[PDB]
């Protein structure tokens, strides 16, 4: 039993809700919140911009030190950093950005990072400003993630489309 509330169950392990991931994180304080990161951990907009804003820029400060030490992530890769005031940990995961020409096959590799964590609060990878089709992202999530994932979808219209079209 966990503290996530109001989710629709899609499969044995995947749950979905129309919710602002920032507000959901602040309420649940999950062990792991997933950020829709880029390789530079520059949290300017989208989910990353919103999460970072909620940390009063502490996420960005921590991220800049991480990059200065380690260099950029790989597309499809991830790193674990602090969750600040939102979660115990933040798993920064880089889905391919379609508006940069990156291979959509890398989306499965990106979701594989979730399997290293028993339970996660997450957005749909490569959705929103990353330019991929969120219906496809949900399909890859369901077919790749085996751990327990709670997906927060900000846009109500998109949420209804995702549920109504789910196979
Ligand atoms: C006032 C304030 C603070 O004090 C601290 C932090 C943020 C805000 C603030 O202005 N929040 C607003 C409202 C929520 C917005 N969410 C998104 O853009 C977003 C995009 C994609 N997503 C996928 C799942 N969830 C997602 N959410 C961002 C703008």
UniProtKB/Swiss-Prot annotation:
Regulation: Inhibited in vitro by GRL-0617.
Catalysed reactions, as listed in the record: Thiol-dependent hydrolysis of ester, thioester, amide, peptide and isopeptide bonds formed by the C-terminal Gly of ubiquitin (a 76-residue protein attached to proteins as an intracellular targeting signal)
Impact reported for residue 164 to L: In strain: Gamma/P.1
Macro domain sequence ranges: 1-167
Signal sequence region: none
Compartments, record wording: Host endoplasmic reticulum membrane
Membrane topology summary: Multi-pass membrane protein
Name used for this protein in its record: Papain-like protease nsp3
Organism from which the protein derives: Severe acute respiratory syndrome coronavirus 2
């Amino acid at each position: 039993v966990n503290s996530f509330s109001g989710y629709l169950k899609l499969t044995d392990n995947v749950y979905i809700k129309n919710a602002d991931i920032v507000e959901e994180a602040k309420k649940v304080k999950p062990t792991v919140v997933v950020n829709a990161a880029n390789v530079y951990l520059k949290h300017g907009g989208g989910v990353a911009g919103a999460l970072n804003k909620a940390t009063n820029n502490a996420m960005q400060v921590e991220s800049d030190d991480y990059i200065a030490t380690n260099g950029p992530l790989k597309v499809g890769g991830s790193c674990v950093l602090s969750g600040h005031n939102l979660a115990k940990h933040c798993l920064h995961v880089v889905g391919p950005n379609v508006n940069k020409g990156e291979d959509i096959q890398l989306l499965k590799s990106a979701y594989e990072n979730f399997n290293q964590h028993e339970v996660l609060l997450a957005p749909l990878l490569s959705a929103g400003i990353f330019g991929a089709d969120p219906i496809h992202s949900l399909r890859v999530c369901v077919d790749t993630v085996r751990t327990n994932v709670y997906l927060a979808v900000f846009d109500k219209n998109l949420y209804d489309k995702l549920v109504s079209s789910f196979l």
